[PDB]
């Protein structure tokens with residue numbers, strides 16, 4: 526079967542570069558698609574805006590930075606979680622502090638996967654584990 | 666592409682069960698094939714003994730318990746590393762103590778991946794990382 530993309534949603538240019546590098550350097554094979562705000566993220570997930578008739582399919586996981594312009598990360602989260610056609614898509618929240626996580630947990634949106642930036646593979650894989658996502662070793 | 670099997674080489678019945686359970690519980694998709702001593706391991710890798718004309722292909726990784734009867738783990742390691750047709754296969758050494766690792770490192774066999782038993786996913790994934798093995802998230 527074909528690998529599905531990772532959706533990385535991130536507004537900070539440096540956080541973007543760091544996370545992309547971390548994912549590459551841990552030899553994750555899935556291609557990463559980048560959204561820079563909540564608008565871009567939801568357009569991707571719903572195959573519209575710039576992404577109309579894009580290579581369809583849901584991402585393997587969404588890495589969702591919490592604070593975004595235009596449409597906030599929490600909004601993206603609420604829309605994925607509250608939508609019938611999206612709620613199955615696994616979401617890892619990216620935050621700058623552990624305390625931002627406490628706030629997110631208070632919203633009771635059933636998020637169990639968090640990574641505190643900078644993203645590194647130990648915390649990333651733990652989030653994968655927290656999500657119950659299946660993973661595989663490749664021979665390539 | 667088809668996923669390749671994990672080869673787990675383990676003589677202790679309880680260590681076998683624990684490791685199998687850990688691999689299942691971290692949602693690793695690759696099937697696990699079990700060898701119980703160095704003889705069984707090398708037969709598998711060379712597609713002979715019980716494994717003649719088996720579904721061919723090299724494993725994605727070999728998880729190799731260090732002490733085995735008949736043919737010792739170190740022997741299996743030396744044979745994989747010193748053989749032209751096997752040396753590309755990634756090997757994680759399983760040990761009972763960190764000190765067993767120091768001995769293995771003294772043999773200068775280019776092993777960078779170790780897990781101390783009981784196997785758990787954090788140490789397992791770190792070994793995957795130490796080996797430079799590619800990995801993927803599945804949608805299943």
Ligand SMILES: [Mg+2]
Nearest residue numbers: 536590592593
């Ligand atoms: Mg942000």
Ligand SMILES: [Mg+2]
Nearest residue numbers: 676730732733
């Ligand atoms: Mg043993």
